[PDB]
Amino acid sequence: EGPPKYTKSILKKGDKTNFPKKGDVVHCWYTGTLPDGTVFDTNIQTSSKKKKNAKPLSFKVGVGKVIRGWDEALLTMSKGEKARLEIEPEWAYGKKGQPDAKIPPNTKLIFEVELVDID
Numbered sequence: 524e525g526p527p528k529y530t531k532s533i534l535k536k537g538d539k540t541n542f543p544k545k546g547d548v549v550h551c552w553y554t555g556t557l558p559d560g561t562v563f564d565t566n567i568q569t570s571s572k573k574k575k576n577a578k579p580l581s582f583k584v585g586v587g588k589v590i591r592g593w594d595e596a597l598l599t600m601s602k603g604e605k606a607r608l609e610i611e612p613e614w615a616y617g618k619k620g621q622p623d624a625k626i627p628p629n630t631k632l633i634f635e636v637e638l639v640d641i642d
């Protein structure tokens with residue numbers, strides 16, 4: 524189980540009342556960055572689609588739909604919370620990384636994650 528192979532720093536507090544449980548479906552805005560500061564992915568729209576059509580990432584939590592660091596971190600977050608996650612390679616894409624997805628081998632990944640809603 525532990526200790527966790529990720530760290531969480533809370534950037535914006537959530538409601539501190541509604542926490543996702545394993546099997547809940549969550550919705551999030553995220554930005555993913557490498558240790559060098561390069562943004563590798565984001566689902567946050569720059570403009571004119573900021574609200575018009577953009578859809579947040581949707582997944583069922585705690586069941587291995589996402590990398591381990593996200594799955595465990597989400598369980599610690601409350602609705603509306605914005606957090607910075609630093610995730611070791613072992614709880615991300617492993618030692619090999621995911622080159623076809625732009626993730627280099629053996630690199631920590633930094634995500635800013637906002638938990639919008641829980642179903």
Ligand SMILES: CO[C@H]1C[C@@H]2CC[C@@H](C)[C@@](O)(O2)C(=O)C(=O)N2CCCC[C@H]2C(=O)O[C@H]([C@H](C)C[C@@H]2CC[C@@H](O)[C@H](OC)C2)CC(=O)[C@H](C)/C=C(\C)[C@@H](O)[C@@H](OC)C(=O)[C@H](C)C[C@H](C)/C=C/C=C/C=C/1C
Binds near residue numbers: 593
């Ligand atoms: C264009 O953007 C991509 C997301 C990209 C992919 C490449 C990575 C770098 C990245 O840039 O995201 C990224 O930033 C990243 O690493 N992410 C994304 C955000 C959550 C954390 C992490 C992740 O785990 O991605 C995930 C990672 C890449 C793959 C998983 C890693 C954990 C492993 O255990 C899983 O095995 C199952 C596979 C991708 C996802 O977040 C999507 C949502 C989830 C899946 C594809 C799987 O759960 C899949 O098979 C179960 C499903 O059940 C889904 C719902 C089926 C439906 C049809 C697919 C929808 C696909 C949406 C794809 C999206 C939005």
